[PDB]
Amino acid sequence: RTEKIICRDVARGYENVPIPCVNGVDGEPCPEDYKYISENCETSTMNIDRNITHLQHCTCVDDCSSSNCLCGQLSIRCWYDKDGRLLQEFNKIEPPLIFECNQACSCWRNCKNRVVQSGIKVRLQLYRTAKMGWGVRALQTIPQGTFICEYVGELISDAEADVREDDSYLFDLDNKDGEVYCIDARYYGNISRFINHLCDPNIIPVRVFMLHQDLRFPRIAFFSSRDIRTGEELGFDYGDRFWDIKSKYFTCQCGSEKCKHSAEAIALEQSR
């Protein structure tokens, strides 16, 4: 049973790098029951505030590496090192909101505070897992704090999320208050839609603002939470909102010693 290259690039050239699909496990064809999009899309009236006069922006004439950069200060500080990687001290538990530089800023497009807006740089692969369907793995080593990819899909309201038949591809956009919105990657999504849950995760979501600062719509950036080895499967914690609903349909197959959502773990808690 050989590992076969089934698609040279599921992103159809929309990313900085190709994202190939292989399958060495079963007869599943390349997934095509969805539309690959590299950036979030709208299917109803959202009115994202794109007023350029509403952007907070810096007056930096350097590379935005100084603590005097307004955009960094909105983020508490800029959290990216000279190489575009999150600082070791970054709060991976309760990440702060990141405000990247933007088109109102006086700085250049290559300033130090533009990691997420610059897109995917690591080589990834869509591959058939043993027990969890499709998954995404690294084709190279990835240091801690590296930007991996964005959780991209269809923006929907809370009310629309409430009636979506498939709730498997939802991501909540947390905001101080208000109407609350979700990304649904079921019908429209990028590579992130294929990232599985791991009880021992190696990536974390961070809310980021770039070309707009409409707080209803943070963009969701995945960064590595530790060093990742070539071939390693990417995964994040889907959280209890997911597992509270899904546990009765199926159980976690992440296979970790720490697995908290396996059949075994659920039964042990049922039993108390």
Ligand X SMILES: C[S@@+](CC[C@H](N)C(=O)[O-])C[C@H]1O[C@@H](n2cnc3c(N)ncnc32)[C@H](O)[C@@H]1O
CA dihedral 209, 101, 78, 124 (to 10 degrees): 70
Q: Does 155 bind ligand A1AEB (CB under 6 A)?
A: no
C-alpha distances in Å from residue 133, one per residue of 11, 167, 171, 215, 266: 19, 16, 19, 34, 21
CA angle 125, 127, 128 (to 5 degrees): 170
Pick from 80, 99, 169, 222 the residue near ligand A1AEB by CB under 6 A: 169
Which residues participate in the annotated binding site for S-adenosyl-L-methionine? Answer: 132-134, 169, 196-197, 253
Residue 235 backbone dihedrals phi, psi, to 5 degrees: -165, 150
Residue from 57, 193, 212, 216 that binds ligand X (CB under 6 A)? 193
Residues in the annotated binding site for Zn(2+): 58, 60, 64, 69, 71, 101, 105, 107, 111, 199, 252, 254, 259
Residues annotated in a binding site = 58, 60, 64, 69, 71, 101, 105, 107, 111, 132-134, 169, 196-197, 199, 252-254, 259
Asked if residue 168 binds ligand X (CB under 6 A), the reply is yes
> Would you say 30 or 265 has its CB closer to Zn ion?
265
Binding range to ligand A1AEB, per CB under 6 A, among 53-61, 74-82, 121-129, 160-168: 160-168
The residues, ordered by sequence, that sit 6+ positions from 216 with a Cβ below 8 Å of its Cβ are 48, 173, 175, 178, 179, 181
Neighbours of 38 (CB within 10 A): 18
* Closer residue to ligand A1AEB (CB): 90 or 238: 238
Contacted by 105, from ligand A1AEB, ligand X, Zn ion, none: CB < 5 to 8 Å by type: Zn ion
Choose the stretch contacting ligand A1AEB; rule: CB under 6 A; options: 28-36, 87-95, 119-127, 166-174.
Answer: 166-174
How far apart (Å, rounded) are the C-alpha atoms in residues 44 and 158?
13
93 token code pair: 């538990």
**Residue with the two structure tokens 């399958």:** 23
Q: Which one of residues 79, 90, 147, 171 is an interface residue with ligand A1AEB (CB under 6 A)?
A: 171
Cβ-based burial of 239 (10 A; exposed 0-12, middle 13-18, buried ≥19):
exposed
CB of 108 or CB of 250, closer to ligand A1AEB: 250
194 binds ligand A1AEB (CB under 6 A): no
